Symmetry: D2
Subunit: 298 residues, 4 copies
């Protein structure tokens, strides 16, 4: 005889997803664009809309959309991180029924066109070299926490990669390799915690450079990777060493193996000339590192 008495609400969450818009800014003839996709989710201090059919405290998801568009118009978007902070602060300062707010934003990667070294006043091209995103979240009476990241970042090096000295058992057929293609799709996300004493765009760029440089090694010789997992650690340690603002960094590496096609039966000798990617199944590894000092201090 199952009633509300027997049942606990563990979690209730709602929001508006994929709010797409472009913020246009004009300085005379020169146009500036920031196109974004925004998700904003709320947890309310009550669940009457679920438990009783009573919508009294529910802010319509339509109103969440309107608030995002109004703030874009009124505040502009200097950085997606500042815009995410503004949205979270709006919900927390305005609505007592909001226990928690989270805003996710990703940039549409528009770049200004150039003709013969001259930047175009109002013409752009889509150049996805890794999607910039950020995330702000706040519990009522808790810290406002900001994360930034880069996803759908596909990096490949054609050498200075192996995987040797791994655990062997009766189901292990993988050969030892000291030369292979290292191809990874990266999801990288880092927390600034509460710190905001810096330029969000400059620090995002600095973290991106650390990820590319740690992945590749120096351009004249590169650097040997003994595993996907070690490359993830090199990226994380490089970011933490060079960017003090990063408190916690998560890196997910989804890899594609490139197989040297055996062409003996086709009367041919394939000396790492023709390689076929395996898209599925695929390996993943994931690590989150945090500074001892930041975790201790809570």
């Amino acid at each position: 005889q199952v009633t509300i008495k027997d049942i606990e609400v563990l979690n209730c969450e709602y929001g508006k997803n994929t709010i797409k818009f472009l913020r246009l800014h004009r300085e005379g003839k020169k146009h500036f664009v920031k196109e974004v996709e925004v998700c904003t989710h709320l947890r309310l201090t009550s669940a009457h809309e679920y438990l009783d059919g009573n919508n009294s405290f529910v802010i319509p998801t339509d109103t969440i959309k309107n608030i995002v568009l109004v703030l874009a118009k009124k505040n502009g978007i200097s950085s997606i991180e500042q815009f995410a902070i503004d949205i979270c602060k709006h919900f927390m300062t305005t609505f007592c029924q909001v226990a928690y707010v989270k805003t996710y934003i990703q940039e549409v990667p528009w770049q200004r066109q150039y003709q013969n070294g001259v930047p175009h006043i109002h013409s752009f091209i889509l150049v996805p070299d890794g999607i910039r995103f950020c995330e702000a979240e706040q519990c009522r009476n808790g810290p406002l926490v900001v994360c930034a990241g880069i996803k759908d970042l596909k990096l490949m090096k054609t050498t200075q990669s192996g995987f040797e000295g791994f655990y062997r058992n009766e189901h292990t057929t993988l050969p030892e390799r000291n030369d292979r293609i290292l191809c990874g799709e990266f999801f990288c996300k880092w927390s600034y915690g509460e710190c905001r004493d810096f330029d969000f765009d400059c620090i995002w760029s600095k973290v991106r450079e650390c990820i590319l440089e740690a992945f590749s090694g120096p351009p004249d010789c590169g650097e040997y990777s003994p595993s996907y997992q070690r490359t993830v650690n090199c990226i994380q340690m490089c970011v933490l060493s060079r960017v003090p603002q990063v408190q916690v960094i998560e890196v997910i590496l989804n890899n594609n193996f490139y197989n040297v096609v055996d062409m003996k039966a086709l009367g041919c000798t394939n000396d790492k000339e023709v390689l076929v990617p395996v898209e599925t199944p695929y390996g993943s590894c994931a690590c989150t590192l945090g500074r001892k000092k930041y975790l201790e201090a809570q």
Copy 2:
């Protein structure tokens, strides 16, 4: 910093996880001329008892993701697949009993929805058609020395009712332009996931089917009149309470409803009168709501 560099000393590993994703295969079973298929997609992830592969470049304890794939295929061949839940349990148990360096294993499985073809009510011995009316999945996970926990679910389940839906009496402020509505199309894409915890005294396929029926029936109401929904959130609660009322084996149920609004096109400027005849779906932006309900007795009984 006051250091030119962080070292292992300054850093904590909060999480390390690796695995094999999208292991696709079909398990074929023959009873004379009659063929039976189970095609699945499997993901298996491990956490090891150390992170030396990350911290030191030492792969001694790393089970190749290739070996994870080989083990999944061997177990499919040796054990068969009576249910994806039993197969996920078998995979988790294999990793825990075989590899001392495994601290944690998680197996996710989804079924390719093959249905046997029929001609004039007669089942075909060996011919199938793909019919995605909601993707069946399950998830098993175990910490070393902890419970083996099994969840089942259905995702990409798209349900629509053309009436008996409104949203009224919501909070109003200066940015609220949404009108009150007591008649609209309720169109939802559902993700539903439920925990059996450690309980296994039942047929996984029969109970999965029972939960699916509860979801469709609670969404729709009775076939002769339906049932009024005063919000997406209330419909989620009706689905959850229906499952919890009718299926004692479900301890915890999560439901996510991603909705599409269908707008009655204003056709006045085109010289005609649209009386809820032509409606245009809004795919983005879209609303979502999510609720997880659990039995007090099951949650209490854990620590």
Copy 3:
């Protein structure tokens, strides 16, 4: 380089992915037809391209408005009749239209049932092959109607092989008399100008022919010596059983299911565990027409 040096070989424009649901009520009982419509025009002039002169251009926005107005005024008895109505509207209304093509696909909503009782107003999405149609007309030429089914995925676990094929120095494929036959089908058939029949009944009849020819009889099935032969069996079955079909195109995109070699893993895979190859993939395509219909042009 000027207008003088250049020929316009082709000019075409239109509105894509017009999505809407047409709701019809018979008391408490609701009926839905949700569709995605594309409508394309060729104009008798290209001044909008060649001179920057939009005088004859029907805005793509107007194409959308016309599709929605016709849905409201006429209803949708069948997507084929709706595609005919759209093509006729553009041809009879706009002298600047040289050519119109309307593509329509159905969102595959099915009415929910509880204990064998149909629900008055509740539906579930069941994509077991997308129904579509295409109507096209050149100015004062025939209005031609095609219907079809795409994203139709059929699989049989035996009664399939591929043997006796051409061998050369780059041919490693073994002969096989037992394999899984798994195909994603695109099927499209022309009624030409004929309209003396129920579009929904004939569509259903063609779908049944495709499933039955693919599968063979349910007690024993039927051996397929190639993907290409299975395509021919489907086409000949449709042409035999559905006189209204004049021309039928079938595309079969196949997935090979490989019996995993498990010798190195210390066991024996007797066609028990098979791994699908999604890419690269084989395709074959055939279009058959009735002599009578082709001759009579």
Copy 4:
């Protein structure tokens, strides 16, 4: 219904999505060309379909093997030359082949740079337009080569309108002399049989013409009176500046950006916040050819 009553209008088969990377080393410096290849054949007979006789069928598996062997033996100087090599191989090797078509697209790997210094062996995926080419040949006919760029998304925030279009009772679109012009481009051009040039240099030249004609000069831009006129400006720019292009097809799929009405929200939106409409969407397409090239057939 038998073979007697039916004509085969078309038979075609092939291998789709052959993915591989061709690696080339000059000491420490690595060069990559990763491609996706489709190769389709029409055979001189249809016995595999009509009779269940596979004697002349080249397995699609052999098509894959041939593509990989040619990549290994010849390298890939350009995807156009590789597509030519594949077509020539099938025509010279197999007398049962009536027709061959090879489609190739590049995976857009770019070499990584650190402060202007190229990395010897490290790359990043940067899809700013997918490069493709297509070669086709009928037995005893010319080997024809086309090159192109697709999924090219360009946007300008002004110097775009659409005015003076045809009005009727279903036309609600207002006249506009200022709007965002946002287009996803598919561009494809024919060299015909001509091959007296560097395929990579000419591809780059055509890409620059497309960007420059779309944008106009960087200090003022150039007014577009329609999507259709912008397509014409791109085509005429390519034809003016690249003599090797004989025929050019351009498809523009547009997204309208709507200035959100914010009056009800107590706000004044002066082209500050714009929401893109992804569906439905307008398209226009034009193919232009040189008189000289078309006449000379």
